[PDB]
Design a protein around this ligand. Structure first.
Ligand code: 0MJ
Ligand code: NAG
Length: 337
């Protein structure tokens, strides 16, 4: 392991408080893609020019053309990548990737099968996995491991800032450090249960003053690629009953006029309570008694080995600026500015 002095940053675009994406350049000359930086996965993928136009998601997204890149190195190995909302498949390729002004030779997936549900809803083209090699499909070296290998970064850390929707900064990723302009106070660290996954121990979930859930302890995946806070179907049913929310097909809702009256939700992580008020978890679209307002908390049954687990996504990161520490296998949280 080599350390330099360089800190690099990627400006993110906030789409509806659900999608935070930045830009990467792939190839020579660079082909630009809108990408989500996901701590819950470890593969890099973008849609391929080899994607059949009968996949409508491929008509609506930027496609990587290897035939236009002079730095491209063929691989051809087939791979399937499974997410919570859907699945993508294609093959592996190698090329130069630029992310925050850091140029790295990276093995990535060229997606040839991209389903309209959910990919037509995606403002981003692809994904940049910020997880560990242990989660990488095809044991492909992740981009952050390749960036560490260069020995340019001041520290083996990366930090996430997700803003509240607005013509301001959507968010920001710092490679090799943190940005003090985006947090206040000091970081409180929670060690990873084990290397290989950005997952920490959770000591309890409170609805108001009472610790209703996770009383005997549970898991919390700190996931930048997840839009919401998620728990198991069972945990979410208890949580929603306590809030007074109604289950719909894809989400939970409350009558808009009752959004501001909902109790605080607290997450016990390390030696601290991480509290979200209703303003932090309700999509307060109106105050009308004749309208339904969505919550930024969903049921998600994450399969083993990673799951059953809670996932602390954009809902959580908006309130708490997050530092992912590779050198010490820990996650730091500080109050976001
Ligand atoms: C079945 C299954 C459940 C859960 C998981 S997991 O371990 O929790 N994986 C997570 C890792 N972080 C991102 C999660 C996710 O899909 N977020 C949703 C987000 C996304 C992020 C990355 C890739 C694809 C992807 O699809 C869309 C499409 C439209 C809008 C938003 C997204 C899945 C894997 C597989
Ligand atoms: C594809 O890449 C892997 C490394 O990730 C390598 O071991 C393998 O030999 C490559 N295959 C081809 C056909 O180049």
């Amino acid at each position: 392991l080599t350390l330099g002095n360089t800190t690099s940053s990627v400006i993110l675009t906030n789409y509806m408080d659900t999608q935070y994406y930045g830009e990467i350049g792939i190839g020579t000359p660079p082909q630009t893609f809108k990408v989500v930086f996901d701590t819950g996965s470890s593969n890099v993928w973008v849609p391929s020019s080899k994607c059949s136009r009968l996949y409508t998601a491929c008509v609506y997204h930027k496609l990587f053309d290897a035939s236009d890149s002079s730095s491209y190195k063929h691989n051809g190995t087939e791979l399937t990548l499974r997410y919570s909302t859907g699945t993508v498949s294609g093959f592996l390729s190698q090329d130069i990737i630029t992310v925050g002004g850091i140029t790295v030779t990276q093995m990535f997936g060229e997606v040839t099968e991209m389903p309209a549900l959910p990919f037509m809803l995606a403002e981003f083209d692809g994904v940049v996995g910020m997880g560990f090699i242990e989660q990488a499909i095809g044991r492909v070296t992740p981009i952050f491991d390749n960036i560490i290998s260069q020995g340019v970064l001041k520290e083996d850390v990366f930090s996430f800032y997700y803003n509240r929707d607005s013509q301001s900064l959507g968010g920001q990723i710092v490679l090799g450090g943190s940005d003090p302009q985006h947090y206040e106070g000091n970081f409180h660290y929670i060690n990873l249960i084990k290397t290989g996954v950005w997952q920490i121990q959770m000591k309890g979930v409170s609805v108001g003053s009472s610790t209703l859930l996770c009383e005997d302890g549970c898991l919390a995946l700190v996931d930048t690629g997840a839009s919401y806070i998620s728990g198991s179907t069972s945990s979410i049913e208890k949580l929603m009953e306590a809030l007074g929310a109604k289950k719909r097909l894809f989400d939970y809702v409350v009558k808009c006029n009752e959004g501001p009256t909902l109790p605080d939700i607290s997450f016990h992580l390390g030696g601290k309570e991480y509290t979200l008020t209703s303003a932090d978890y309700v999509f307060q679209e109106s105050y009308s008694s004749k309208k339904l307002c969505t919550l930024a908390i969903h049921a998600m049954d994450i399969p083993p080995p990673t799951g059953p687990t809670w996932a602390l996504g954009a809902t959580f990161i908006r309130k708490f600026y997050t530092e992912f520490d590779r050198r010490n296998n820990r996650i730091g949280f500080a109050l976001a500015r």
